[PDB]
Every structure is written in structure tokens, then in C-alpha cells.
Amino acid sequence: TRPNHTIYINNLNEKIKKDELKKSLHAIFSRFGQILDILVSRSLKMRGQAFVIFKEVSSATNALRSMQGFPFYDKPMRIQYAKTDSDIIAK
Amino acid sequence: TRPNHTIYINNLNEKIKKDELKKSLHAIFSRFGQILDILVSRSLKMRGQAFVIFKEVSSATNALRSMQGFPFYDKPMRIQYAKTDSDIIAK
Amino acid sequence: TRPNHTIYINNLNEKIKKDELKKSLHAIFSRFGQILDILVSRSLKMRGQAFVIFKEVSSATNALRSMQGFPFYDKPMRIQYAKTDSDIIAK
Amino acid sequence: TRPNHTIYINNLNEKIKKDELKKSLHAIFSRFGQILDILVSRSLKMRGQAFVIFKEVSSATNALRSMQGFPFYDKPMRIQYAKTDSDIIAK
RNA sequence: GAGGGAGAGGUGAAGAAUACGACCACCUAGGUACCAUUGCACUCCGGUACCUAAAACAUACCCUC
RNA sequence: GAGGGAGAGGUGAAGAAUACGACCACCUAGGUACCAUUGCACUCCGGUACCUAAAACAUACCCUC
RNA sequence: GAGGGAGAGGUGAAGAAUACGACCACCUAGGUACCAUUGCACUCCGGUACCUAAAACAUACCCUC
RNA sequence: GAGGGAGAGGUGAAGAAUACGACCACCUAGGUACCAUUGCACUCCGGUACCUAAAACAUACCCUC
Ligand SMILES: CN(C)[C@@H]1C(O)=C(C(N)=O)C(=O)[C@@]2(O)C(O)=C3C(=O)c4c(O)ccc(Cl)c4[C@@](C)(O)[C@H]3C[C@@H]12
Ligand SMILES: CN(C)[C@@H]1C(O)=C(C(N)=O)C(=O)[C@@]2(O)C(O)=C3C(=O)c4c(O)ccc(Cl)c4[C@@](C)(O)[C@H]3C[C@@H]12
Ligand SMILES: CN(C)[C@@H]1C(O)=C(C(N)=O)C(=O)[C@@]2(O)C(O)=C3C(=O)c4c(O)ccc(Cl)c4[C@@](C)(O)[C@H]3C[C@@H]12
Ligand SMILES: CN(C)[C@@H]1C(O)=C(C(N)=O)C(=O)[C@@]2(O)C(O)=C3C(=O)c4c(O)ccc(Cl)c4[C@@](C)(O)[C@H]3C[C@@H]12
Ligand SMILES: [Mg+2]
Ligand SMILES: [Mg+2]
Ligand SMILES: [Mg+2]
Ligand SMILES: [Mg+2]
Ligand SMILES: [Mg+2]
Ligand SMILES: [Mg+2]
Ligand SMILES: [Mg+2]
Ligand SMILES: [Mg+2]
Ligand SMILES: [Mg+2]
Ligand SMILES: [Mg+2]
Ligand SMILES: [Mg+2]
Ligand SMILES: [Mg+2]
Ligand SMILES: [Mg+2]
Ligand SMILES: [Mg+2]
Ligand SMILES: [Mg+2]
Ligand SMILES: [Mg+2]
Ligand SMILES: [Mg+2]
Ligand SMILES: [Mg+2]
Ligand SMILES: [Mg+2]
Ligand SMILES: [Mg+2]
Ligand SMILES: [Mg+2]
Ligand SMILES: [Mg+2]
Ligand SMILES: [Mg+2]
Ligand SMILES: [Mg+2]
Ligand SMILES: [Mg+2]
Ligand SMILES: [Mg+2]
Ligand SMILES: [Mg+2]
Ligand SMILES: [Mg+2]
Ligand SMILES: [Mg+2]
Ligand SMILES: [Mg+2]
Ligand SMILES: [Mg+2]
Ligand SMILES: [Mg+2]
Ligand SMILES: [Mg+2]
Ligand SMILES: [Mg+2]
Ligand SMILES: [Mg+2]
Ligand SMILES: [Mg+2]
Ligand SMILES: [Mg+2]
Ligand SMILES: [Mg+2]
Ligand SMILES: [Mg+2]
Ligand SMILES: [Mg+2]
Ligand SMILES: [Mg+2]
Ligand SMILES: [Mg+2]
Ligand SMILES: [Mg+2]
Ligand SMILES: [Mg+2]
Ligand SMILES: [Mg+2]
């Protein structure tokens, strides 16, 4: 994919409760720049995944490159740019 | 919060015994500067949490920024400045 | 061993499914340069092990040195140069 | 303690078999310099502990400082200088 | 008589031909399994169930003669 | 007659008033729990036990009338 | 009469000498164990089993007198 | 007679018409589950329970004829 304000994370530990996952993702990622939102759902299709929306695409890029494969509750994070803009970025 | 000599850590693994937790927190954090004390309680309200008191606010700041989200017994540490001075700092 | 386009990893967590292992190994290693392939088998003789084939021996060398002992699904990765060229490198 | 060619590690995961522990400790530590030996015993008194003997005290010092608190099979390593020279260093 | 065995987390009560372990009452520290808890403190203190807390001798107690 | 229900991992055999799922035989991929394995490859392939592999109709099969 | 005890996730129905908890019907949030899921979203929503959702009084209900 | 089957961690004892596996005694390495242990070493060595330690033939042993 191509750089995007939003990174898509998967291979996340699915036992982690939604709000803990968000707070923890925030703690991994805030070092890279300002975060607008972190979206998590534990539904069947969306579990093990998160979207982290940065204010700036440069934050997204550094995040993705630095945290690629990083240990997070016992599994390595796999990180991609989101395939499309998040609503709050497009709008 | 605002910088403080003391950092507040949570999202800690609650199976870890108090003295092990302290010794381990000391090993994460001593690289950042001198530590006056580490307070841990496994009570219901205080489990999963620690206070690490640095001699210098600059140590606290580097600690917090470097170790934010860091893997510690299988969970990411979440770090904040303490909301108030610890007794040994105020007094 | 002597430098090789291919690194041999072992001490891998054997519960991890083959395609997850590959995707995760790719996420640990792609930072070091271009990867031609990652070979994994869960057979008795080959479980807990992977071969990661880099385009360039310099990528292999940096990978091996940086990721040596690195946490990966709860175990430290142990990394060596492959003892021989992978087919796609020799051919 | 005072710098020593040998570092003493504890808080090690005690489920890990002796030879795996050695190979893994070797993989954490060889980046710091040449290692003469790694001693591990799983006896009651000596389990959860290792001695890593470096050729040079400077290797020991960098190791200790860099790897202090580092994640190793799910627990943070706690590192000290050995209190005395190992036999192979004294002799 | 012999010879073996087992009992002390702490305080008490009982008993005292007994410094001494069971029974009974009360109180503590530490842990384990499960459940609940994401929580900002600077005497301690969630729940349910289980476990552990130096030890020889002697009395009493158990086995063999 | 009505009305309900359940059966297809793949190939075969049986049966065919039947494209069609059970029984029987054979073969595959993927997984789970436990045990074993630290192992250098570039067709696949450790063990023990369990599970899963699109699905409507029709025949046959099960229930009510 | 006395004295004890237990019941409210939410809506309803029943009942109302009763604001009030069981039974019955319906609906929600959160979790746990196991199984399945590697998945690109920007109302929610996999399965199987289990659990939890402030609480005093009163009626009714249970025990002792 | 035929044909099938199963037994060797190591040392010993028994037995020897037998190099040879069961029974019995003793000793080792490695592991697993649970419990305990945070511990500074440079012969080994916590507990409780379970498991594993190359293997063909022959004797003996088990099944069919
Ligand atoms: C109170 N009396 C009946 C007993 C008694 O008189 C004794 C005696 N020596 O005569 C006791 O020692 C006893 O009072 C006494 O203290 C006993 C005692 O200490 C004890 C302990 O500690 C552990 C196990 C046991 Cl079986 C006993 C036990 C049963 O011996 C009791 C016994 C009584
Ligand atoms: C061989 N014969 C006794 C049966 C038969 O003649 C049939 C028939 N239609 O007459 C079949 O279909 C059958 O040959 C036939 O194929 C059967 C069949 O397919 C089936 C399946 O697939 C699943 C469940 C069931 Cl209970 C059956 C079952 C029992 O109907 C069998 C029946 C036989
Ligand atoms: C409908 N009738 C038989 C009962 C009745 O007439 C009552 C009464 N006060 O007379 C009720 O309160 C009742 O209608 C009524 O509502 C009952 C009730 O609320 C209740 C609750 O909440 C919890 C436990 C229990 Cl045991 C009861 C229970 C049994 O008392 C019922 C009783 C009935
Ligand atoms: C001592 N005597 C009764 C037996 C004997 O005389 C033998 C014989 N060949 O006559 C043995 O081989 C025996 O002494 C002997 O050594 C036996 C033996 O080795 C053995 C093993 O290794 C495994 C399984 C089994 Cl069932 C046996 C077993 C039962 O055959 C014994 C048998 C005895
Ligand atoms: Mg790291
Ligand atoms: Mg006792
Ligand atoms: Mg004792
Ligand atoms: Mg006592
Ligand atoms: Mg005393
Ligand atoms: Mg007294
Ligand atoms: Mg007594
Ligand atoms: Mg008295
Ligand atoms: Mg306690
Ligand atoms: Mg929990
Ligand atoms: Mg408790
Ligand atoms: Mg005694
Ligand atoms: Mg089926
Ligand atoms: Mg199907
Ligand atoms: Mg079939
Ligand atoms: Mg077909
Ligand atoms: Mg056919
Ligand atoms: Mg048929
Ligand atoms: Mg036919
Ligand atoms: Mg398969
Ligand atoms: Mg294993
Ligand atoms: Mg298998
Ligand atoms: Mg159907
Ligand atoms: Mg209730
Ligand atoms: Mg309630
Ligand atoms: Mg209700
Ligand atoms: Mg209301
Ligand atoms: Mg109503
Ligand atoms: Mg009522
Ligand atoms: Mg009415
Ligand atoms: Mg819910
Ligand atoms: Mg899974
Ligand atoms: Mg569910
Ligand atoms: Mg009440
Ligand atoms: Mg055997
Ligand atoms: Mg054998
Ligand atoms: Mg033997
Ligand atoms: Mg021999
Ligand atoms: Mg002999
Ligand atoms: Mg014999
Ligand atoms: Mg003889
Ligand atoms: Mg052993
Ligand atoms: Mg433990
Ligand atoms: Mg043992
Ligand atoms: Mg044989």
C-alpha cells in the first residue's frame, strides 16, 4: 500500500479487552506523533486488528517502520498503511 | 499530567509477587537515573500498578518516554507522571 | 558459518501456524532489505526453524546481528547464516 | 558490586532446559564481545540463574547496562556483576 | 520393660505427676487454583477453595514385643 | 396425502424407479489437546486421541397427522 | 406477636389489601472456559456452555418461638 | 510341526540345554504435570506423581493350527 494517515495493525492478541487494547496501542504509538483515534472491534471479522489514525502521514510512516514486528502481549505486531482514508481524514 | 519526580505505571501483570515486581521495575528503570523508592501494593485497588520515584524530574521524563509501551512480563507498560508528589518528595 | 544471502533461524515457537510464522518473520526482517522467500516447515525435523532469503548478503548480516536473541512469540530467536546457498541463490 | 569479567543473571524462566538457556543467553550476549563460558544449573539453589563470562570486563559492563530488564522468555532479566572472579578468570 | 511412629505459624483455653505439638477458641504472614478488578498511592486489608509457616527430647497418644 | 427433521472433505463400492449425503472400503487438507522433538532445508509425511472440510431440491431414512 | 433469612441487569405479564425482587415471557451490556476465526474498518452482532449487572424497607415467601 | 505376538536404560541375582529382554534387587541420565524455591556458582543432587532411555535372532513366555 501507499502511505496513509492511518495504519492497520493485525496479528494482535485477541484475548485483550477492547479498551485495554486501545490504551496499550496508544502507549506503543503516541511517541510517533498525535493520534486522532484508535478503532478496535472484537467482532469475528475485526478481532486481532486495529486502526490507528495519525494527524500526519509522517507519524504513520515512522510508526509502521519502527514498530513492525514489535512484541505486543506475546505476539509480533504486523503493520500496514490503511487501504483508504478513515472517515475523519477523508471528511 | 505534568512532569513529576514520580512516574505511575499500570497495566502490570498482577501475578507477579511484590518484591519481584520491584526488583524488575528497578531493572527496567535504573538506567534513567537514581531511584529513591518503588512502591507496589497488591491490594484490590492498587494491583497492576507501581510508583517509581526518581531523584530528578529529568530521569522521570526520559523513563516515561523511552519505556512507554515496553514489554514487561507479557504486557505493555503504560506510564504516566504521578498526579501529585510522593510524600518523600513533597516533604 | 560464513556470510550467506540466507539466514537460518531456530528456537522458534512451534505452536505458530506456518503462514503466521512467515508473515511474522517477514515483519521482523523486511526492515533489513529485500526478501526473496521465507521457508517454513512444521515437520518433525524442520519445526521451530526458518530460512529467510535476502537479495543481498549485507541484508542477511545486519538482520542476523540486530535480531540475535530478539523476543518473538515468547522465545528468543537464534540466528545463523545458512550453511549453503538456497536453491534460488545458487541457481 | 564492582565490574567483573562475569555477569550474574537471575529472574530467568526456570522451565527452560539448560542447553536451551545457554544457547539463548549466548544469543542475547555475544553481541557485546567474546564469551568464554556460560554456566547454568537447574538445581534448587541455582535455578533461574546464569553466569556469563566475558573475555573482557568492558564487554561485561556494556552487556549489563544494555540488557538490564530486557525481555527473555517472558520475564525481565536482572543482571549484576559476579561477586568474585570465575575460576577460569582467577586461574 | 524393649524396639519403632507421629504431632509445635503465633496467642490462649484445657491439662499440668507436663516448658512441649492432638482436641477446642482466637489471631497473623506468605502462597496456590479459579473468579472478579485497569485501578493514582504513600498503617494493613476483594471473593471462593486449598496449602505452608525451625525442631530434638519428655509427658500424653499410635504400632510391635 | 399433510406438516415437520436430519444426512454430502474427496474417490469408490453398494444401490439406481435415484446426479445426491447413512452403512461399508479407501484416500486428502486443515486444526485442537497431550506427549515427544533444538532440529540446516529447498516433492509431502513424529506419536496418541479428538474435530472440521459449500449446500437447496429429490429418492431412501426419522417424527406428527 | 417475637427474633432471624433470603429475592430486584432492564422491559412486561401476573398480582395489586403491594412502587418492590420468585414463577413466566421478552430484551440488553459486560465477562469466563473451550472451539472456530489472520480478518481492512469507520450503527451493533461467530458458536457451545457458564457467570455478572446498586440496594434498605414493605407485601408475599423461608426458619425459630 | 505351522503361522502369528510381545519383552532388553544400565549393573546384578535367578536361570543357563540360554550372549538375550518377564519376575526380584540395586543404580543412572533425560523429561512431564503439580507444589515449593528469587537463589552468587564454578564434582552431581528440592518434593509428590508419572514417563523415556538402539534393537534382529534364539531360549523361555502368549495366541491360532
Ligand atoms: C487431658 N488429658 C485427657 C490428657 C492428659 O491428662 C495428659 C496427660 N499427660 O495425662 C495430657 O498431656 C493432655 O492434656 C494433653 O495435653 C494432650 C496433648 O498435649 C496431646 C498432643 O499435644 C498431641 C497429641 C495427643 Cl493424642 C495429645 C493428648 C491426646 O495426649 C492430650 C491428652 C491430654
Ligand atoms: C439399499 N436399499 C436398502 C436402500 C434403497 O433401496 C434405496 C432406495 N431409494 O430404495 C436407497 O436409496 C439406498 O441405496 C441408499 O443409498 C441409502 C442412502 O443413500 C441413505 C443416505 O444417503 C443417508 C441416510 C440413509 Cl438412512 C440412507 C438409506 C438408509 O436410505 C439408504 C437406503 C438404500
Ligand atoms: C400471586 N399470589 C400467589 C401471590 C400474592 O397474592 C401475593 C400477595 N402478596 O398476596 C404476591 O405478592 C405475589 O403476586 C408475588 O408478586 C410474589 C412475589 O413478588 C414474590 C417475589 O418477588 C419473590 C419471591 C416470592 Cl416466594 C414471591 C411470591 C411467592 O410471594 C409471589 C406471591 C404472589
Ligand atoms: C526359571 N525358569 C522358570 C524359566 C526357565 O527355566 C527358562 C528356560 N528357558 O527354561 C528361562 O529362560 C527363565 O529363567 C527366564 O530367564 C525367563 C526369561 O528370561 C523371561 C523374559 O526375559 C521375558 C519374559 C518371560 Cl515370560 C521370561 C520367562 C517367563 O520365560 C522366564 C522363564 C525362566
Ligand atoms: Mg524490545
Ligand atoms: Mg504440620
Ligand atoms: Mg513444623
Ligand atoms: Mg498450634
Ligand atoms: Mg513462645
Ligand atoms: Mg494457659
Ligand atoms: Mg498438651
Ligand atoms: Mg485448670
Ligand atoms: Mg495471608
Ligand atoms: Mg483477569
Ligand atoms: Mg486471596
Ligand atoms: Mg519427635
Ligand atoms: Mg457432517
Ligand atoms: Mg457440509
Ligand atoms: Mg462421504
Ligand atoms: Mg464430484
Ligand atoms: Mg459406483
Ligand atoms: Mg444413497
Ligand atoms: Mg449393482
Ligand atoms: Mg491433516
Ligand atoms: Mg515441548
Ligand atoms: Mg499430528
Ligand atoms: Mg435438506
Ligand atoms: Mg442475583
Ligand atoms: Mg443486585
Ligand atoms: Mg428481573
Ligand atoms: Mg424502573
Ligand atoms: Mg404490569
Ligand atoms: Mg411481586
Ligand atoms: Mg390483573
Ligand atoms: Mg454480552
Ligand atoms: Mg486460536
Ligand atoms: Mg461469545
Ligand atoms: Mg432485604
Ligand atoms: Mg519398554
Ligand atoms: Mg528398547
Ligand atoms: Mg532391565
Ligand atoms: Mg552389556
Ligand atoms: Mg549373573
Ligand atoms: Mg532370561
Ligand atoms: Mg545358579
Ligand atoms: Mg533424572
Ligand atoms: Mg513458581
Ligand atoms: Mg524432579
Ligand atoms: Mg522380536
What is the count of residue pairs from C and D with beta carbons less than 8 Å apart? Answer: 31
- Chain A adjacent subunits, 3+ CB pairs under 8 A: B, C
Helix (H, G, I), strand (E, B) or coil at D29: helix
B49 in contact with nucleic chain E (CB within 7 A): yes
Assess whether B11 (CB) lies less than 7 A from strand E.
yes
Residues B51 and B73: beta-carbon distance below 8 Å: no
* Chain B environment of A24 (Cβ under 8 Å): 11, 69, 75-76, 78
End-to-end CA distance of chain D: 21
Residue D61: which of D85, D22, D29 has the closest Cα? D29
Give phi and psi for C72, each to the nearest 5. -145, 110
Distance CA B23, CA B51 (A): 13
Q: How far apart are CA A82 and CA A60, in angstroms?
A: 10
User: What cell numbers appear for B12 in the block?
Assistant: 502490570
Domain residue ranges of chain D, discontinuous segments joined by +: 1-91
DSSP state for residue A68 in the 8-state scheme: T
β-partners of residue A9 are A50, A79
Nearest beta carbon to residue C69 from set D20, D27, D74: D27
Helices (H), chain A: 18-29, 57-67, 87-90
Is D73 in CB contact (< 8 Å) with chain C? yes
Cell triple for B33: 537515573
CA atoms within 13 A on the CB side of B41: 4
What residues contact residue C8 under an 8 Å CB cut-off, 6+ apart? C49, C50, C51, C79, C80, C81, C82, C83
Of D87, D71, D73, nearest to D5 by C-alpha is D87
| CA dihedral sign of residues B73, A18, B50, D66 | positive
Cell of C55: 537479495
- Please, how many CA atoms are within 13 Å of residue D9, restricted to the half-sphere of its CB? 33
Q: Is B87 exposed, middle or buried (0-12, 13-18, 19+ CB in 10 A)?
A: exposed
Q: Counting runs of H as helices and runs of E as strands, what totals does chain B give?
A: 3, 6
Say if strands D35-40 and A78-81 run parallel, antiparallel, or are unpaired.
unpaired
Would you say A28 and A50 are in contact if contact means Cβ atoms under 8 Å apart?
Answer: no
H runs (alpha helix) in chain B: 18-29, 57-67, 87-90
Determine whether the distance from the CB of A59 to the nearest atom of strand G is below 7 Å: no
How far apart CA C27 and CA D27 sit, in angstroms, is 20
With beta carbons less than 8 A apart as the criterion, state whether B87 and B5 touch.
Answer: no
**Which 8-state DSSP code applies to residue B30?**
G
Nucleotides of H under 7 A from a protein CB: 30-33, 36-42, 44-46
Nucleotides of chain G in contact with protein CB (under 7 A) are 30-33, 36-42, 44-46
- Orientation of helix C57-67 relative to helix C18-29, angle to 10°: 100
Q: Which CATH architecture has domain C1-91?
A: 2-Layer Sandwich (3.30)
- Distance (angstroms) between ligand 2 centre and the Cα of A4 equals 60
| Sign, Cα dihedral of C78, C79, C83, C89 | positive
Q: Nearest to residue C78, comparing CAs of C57, C56, C63? A: C63
Q: Which nucleotides of E are covered by protein (CB under 7 A)?
A: 30-33, 36-42, 44-46
The reply to whether B13 Cβ lies less than 7 angstroms from strand E is: no
- How, if at all, do strands B78-81 and B6-10 pair? antiparallel
CA C60 to CA C80: how far, in whole Å?
Answer: 9
**Distance of B38 CA from G51 C1′ (whole Å):** 37
DSSP E strand boundaries for C1-91: 6-10, 35-40, 50-54, 71-72, 75-76, 78-81
Q: Resolution in A, one decimal?
A: 2.2
What is the sign of the dihedral through the CA atoms of D53, D57, D59 and D63?
A: positive
Cβ contact D81:D7 at 8 Å: yes
Opening angle at CA C69, ends C65 and C74, nearest 5:
145
Nearest CB partner across the interface for C75, out of D29, D31, D73: D73
How many residues are listed for chain C in this entry?
Answer: 91
Amino acid at A85: D
Strand order in the sheet with C6-10: C35-40, C50-54, C6-10, C78-81
C24 — contact with chain D (CB < 8 Å)? no
Kindly state the cell numbers that stand for C25.
518473520
CA D37 to chain CA mean position, Å:
9
Chain D contacts of C75, Cβ < 8 Å? 24, 73
Backbone φ and ψ of C80, nearest 5°: -135, 160
Q: Which of D17, D30, D20 is CA-nearest to residue D60?
A: D30
